[PDB]
């Protein structure tokens, strides 16, 4: 019945590096999806297997936000079933999951003059990743985020909301 901690996940000072993407468990909260949807900052709110406006009426059993910084061009990979270096070796979404991916350009914040290198992605791995796991030449490459990089190179803060629609006990509900 109390409001839901969406702000902390979305407005976190520093996101996690994709190679070790973060995951928060959201529960016992009345999630208000309208505020997120109507916000214009998000370039892409693509919902798979659910209708974005319908979201505010459903109830969910477990919902997780996965948050991490990547380059602008790789965001297309976050779509399920797309094969690439970032998908295969860093973060790969189960085939036909039911979730919504939200992204926004964060070049206002994450980019630093002279480059910010705190963000890493895995350069080498022996085999492709299984759904929703994380792994921890030298195999980690730093991103060179400079404030005047190209749009593809600019960092995009991506939050993936993954939620199961089956009618088990539901602790996260909308109005």
């Amino acid at each position: 019945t109390n409001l839901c901690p969406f702000g902390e996940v979305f407005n976190a000072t520093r996101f996690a590096s994709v190679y070790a993407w973060n995951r928060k468990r959201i529960s016992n909260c009345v999630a208000d999806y309208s505020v997120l949807y109507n916000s214009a900052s998000f370039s892409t709110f693509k919902c798979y297997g659910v209708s974005p406006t319908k979201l505010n009426d459903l109830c969910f059993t477990n919902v997780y936000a996965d948050s991490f910084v990547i380059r602008g061009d790789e965001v297309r990979q976050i779509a399920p079933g797309q094969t690439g270096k970032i998908a295969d070796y860093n973060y790969k979404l189960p085939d036909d999951f039911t979730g919504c991916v939200i992204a926004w350009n964060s070049n206002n914040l994450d980019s630093k003059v002279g480059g910010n290198y705190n963000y890493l992605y895995r350069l080498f791995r022996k085999s492709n990743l299984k759904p929703f796991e994380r792994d921890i030449y030298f195999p980690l490459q730093s991103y060179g985020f400079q404030p005047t990089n190209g749009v593809g190179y600019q960092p995009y803060r991506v939050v993936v909301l993954s939620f199961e629609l089956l009618h088990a006990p539901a602790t996260v509900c909308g109005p």
Partner: antibody
Amino acid sequence: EVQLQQSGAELVKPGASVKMSCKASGYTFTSYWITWVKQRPGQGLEWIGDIYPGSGSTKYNEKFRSEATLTVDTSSTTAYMQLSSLTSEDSAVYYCARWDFYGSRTFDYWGQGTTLTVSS
Amino acid sequence: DIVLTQSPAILSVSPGERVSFSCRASQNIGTIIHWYQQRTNGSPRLLIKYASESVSGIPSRFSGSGSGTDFTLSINSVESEDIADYYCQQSSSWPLTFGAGTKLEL
């Protein structure tokens, strides 16, 4: 050496806005954010808002989204906080601070303490 | 918004006693907490970085501990040189929130 120094002390009648400044020195200005904090006689510190010198982004405490507006002259490396109007409750002591967003995320360098006498 | 409750507002103490403080956040912060001290008339200054380990420059007598949600600070002994208020602060997510502050006194 890195140190921040407050513009000084100002006295004004109510309604008379104050635009005040903390003088930055001794470090690469773009590298470390600037953050403004506020306090009043008899209670502890409260955050006002943040600004990024290298891109001019700003953040605010919701209670002061309207009264305060933050700007920077990244050439001379000095940041400014503008207050639109003043009440006799607003009589307060203000500190300008350094925020190390990309490293420690600490307010490890501060000003000498600006005083605002709002007085009718 | 995380609200950072810190008390007792006055921690009356006799010098030589070990003292302890504690910060309780209103949500999981992780470990991004700091403490600041304010001597009489003075500005605040950073003491503990990431709530457990002393910043490079402060005496080793100041030690932090705790993680996740319950953060605490203890000073091995308080002399009148350390008479000051201490404020909790968090920097994990916006908006940033300072504590109420606690007072040492005889």
